Design a protein around this ligand. Structure first.
Ligand SMILES: [Cl-]
Ligand SMILES: [Cl-]
Ligand SMILES: [Cu+2]
Ligand SMILES: [Cu+2]
Ligand SMILES: [Cu+2]
Ligand SMILES: [Cu+2]
Ligand SMILES: [Cu+2]
Ligand SMILES: [Cu+2]
Ligand SMILES: [Cu+2]
Ligand SMILES: [Cu+2]
Ligand SMILES: [Cu+2]
Ligand SMILES: [Cu+2]
Ligand SMILES: [Cu+2]
Ligand SMILES: [Cu+2]
Ligand code: NA
Lengths: 275, 278, 278
């Protein structure tokens, strides 16, 4: 599968909800909040109207990286684009294809691995909302982009992955030969280095070299900081086979404290060597 | 408007290091007009710049540049006695070169890029005091044919300040929708940071602009940088997003909460900014 | 210039983990000759390496490698029982592949790049103690046609040391003007760093040099890196700048002040260095 040319106007509902233990999450339905929030995927040219309701007892917002939006959808208290308790606001995100401007230069398209998060809970930069769990991934695809069999989102939020307790993953499963897409977001206060055992990717927009002429470094380890995002696709077990392949932050105190998960790659019969 | 010409010119400028109010120190092109950041120096690949440097201060100081060609006598360090004693003068010479094929068949990278200069001698033998006090500034070297901007703004994350300004006090920059704005970004000190701009994005490559449809550089609005990293880009003000008070800030959460924030004020051609109401 | 040939060879080498003077631990290819950093392993894309590994120590130890192809039985972790007990032996196998077209129409990336190996079992299940003690080394995988250097030097920022050495004790590296010098740069431990080289610059891409005039990679002399990052490049020693004691250092100000500094000693043909103290 490859991505089609975009151009459709889409609508979705989103809600901010309290979860257990002082956490907060986004969901596409009341009672369906999750951390991270739901994956939003768009084709370059698509417009998305996000009909957003704050079900909580404190103000909240939705702010997005990378996409086109007018100042009225900035999602900050500074611009009065936040949402009071019980309120509804329609946020509009737009995207565009690349193309040459009249001045002769190449205008970059929206395609990329992006993310949305809160900007008003706790402080006017969303520090409390982000810690509590108000973040989620946005994928914008260019026409012809290769589509994966599955997508997994890994968020290094301070000293946790996806706000989970230390040493509790998350784990992800695949079968040898699956095309697996990873979205990588970082939040909070610390720099991290994401590492994957047994797999590697290109350090460019799609995480895959375009061909023999792409000079991007091929890596299996990458430093990132708060609100960085990137993504890539790998063929699970390619050249290396089945197994319980760790991924972790490579800052030594961070892995030692439990910023680790498993990429569980099964043989076609469902078994996993040595696990 | 237009594009950078071919280089090759021999240029001179005078540069002064001066004390400023409040324990600051700055470079400038004239006495009593020092600034933090210091003056933007622009060269075209091939140009030579002779910097007639004068220390007006009562302590040693130096001038050390990233990226450009210099011989060891313009290194600007005490370690090889290229610093400037109090009250003294020295000529620092910087050269630039074009890219080109070597005799061995390999491709020699050119000098073009976003670079910077700073002190290497005040407080420690790595300029830790000078850098903290404000002795830093931007250097742009352009390749022949590089697109030229309508304006250029330099943003330096120096420890917990922007351009040595106190928390929450700017700087702010203004533009009109459609302006071609160049941003030069430099980091200094002890901390890593992540630079973010609302409403705008750039390419992670030499010029910040994709060269065309075959450039696979990631397009970003957020980038981690550490001490003495430099990069630059050009954006079209309000492109696809309209006028507004577009924030820029470090995205390390405690850093933005403690004032590492500024405003990119993008106006309509009639001067209006929608919903800007501070 | 000289160029890497096509790979495809199957090679074998012995490796040992040994305790070294002063509470350190190192890898080596011969008993009693372990070093920090460990020996440089060089492969052409397609080659296979069987490392016949022996642990001469009193604690379990492993060998884990970045970037290369390996099965789970050569992962080098306790978590899947591919560590080596005291006195034990194990054959670890590393494979590499060329780039090429896939049936789905995508371009599979090759193994070529600047990589590294290290312990994953000493002190903790992530090798924190082993890495601190010095169990790390560089791996270079070359693509057919890659330019070969006159010499290669490995610089490891391991916590607050370079190559586990005390502050202000190097290492220093020697070259003659015109030498083609390869640098492998690895980071380990707990802290981010920014590697900086006076007088020289390189391209932020796979090989550290631009393929030609269509490569838009930023040209840099300063780069932020974190634990287990690796990159490398090649430079012409003194090119456009001449002979001298060219410092390299972390540019985090407190780190360079504390001694994360070394010298790139570039000599004239007669072996002297204008302005230096041997
Ligand atoms: Cl302005
Ligand atoms: Cl690939
Ligand atoms: Cu913001
Ligand atoms: Cu981490
Ligand atoms: Cu690994
Ligand atoms: Cu953000
Ligand atoms: Cu220096
Ligand atoms: Cu910051
Ligand atoms: Cu934003
Ligand atoms: Cu510097
Ligand atoms: Cu690991
Ligand atoms: Cu450092
Ligand atoms: Cu320097
Ligand atoms: Cu590692
Ligand atoms: Na690149």
């Amino acid at each position: 599968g490859a991505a089609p040319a975009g151009g459709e106007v889409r609508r979705v509902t989103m809600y901010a909800e309290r979860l257990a233990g002082g956490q907060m999450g986004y969901g596409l339905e009341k009672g369906k909040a999750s951390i991270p929030g739901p994956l939003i995927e768009l084709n370059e040219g698509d417009t998305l109207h996000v009909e957003f309701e704050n079900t909580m007892d404190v103000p909240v917002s939705l702010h997005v990286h990378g996409l086109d939006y007018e100042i009225s959808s900035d999602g900050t208290k500074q611009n009065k684009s936040h949402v009071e308790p019980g309120g509804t606001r329609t946020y509009t995100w737009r995207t565009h294809e690349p193309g040459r401007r009249a001045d002769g230069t190449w205008r970059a398209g929206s395609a990329g691995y992006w993310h949305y998060h809160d900007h008003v809970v706790g402080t006017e930069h969303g520090t409390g909302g982000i810690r509590n769990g108000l973040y989620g991934p946005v994928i914008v695809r260019r026409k012809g982009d290769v589509l994966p069999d599955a997508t997994h989102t890994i968020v290094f939020n301070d000293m946790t992955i996806n706000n989970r307790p230390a040493h509790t993953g998350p784990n992800f499963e695949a079968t040898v030969g699956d095309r697996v897409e990873i979205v990588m977001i970082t939040h909070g206060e610390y720099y991290h280095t994401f590492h994957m055992h047994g797999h590697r990717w290109a350090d460019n927009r799609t995480g895959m070299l375009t061909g023999p002429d792409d000079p991007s470094q091929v890596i299996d380890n990458k430093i990132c900081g708060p609100a960085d995002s990137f993504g890539f696709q790998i063929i699970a077990g390619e050249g290396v086979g089945a197994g319980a392949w760790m991924y972790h932050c490579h800052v030594q105190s961070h892995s030692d404290m439990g910023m680790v998960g498993l990429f569980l790659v099964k043989k076609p019969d469902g078994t996993i060597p040595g696990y």
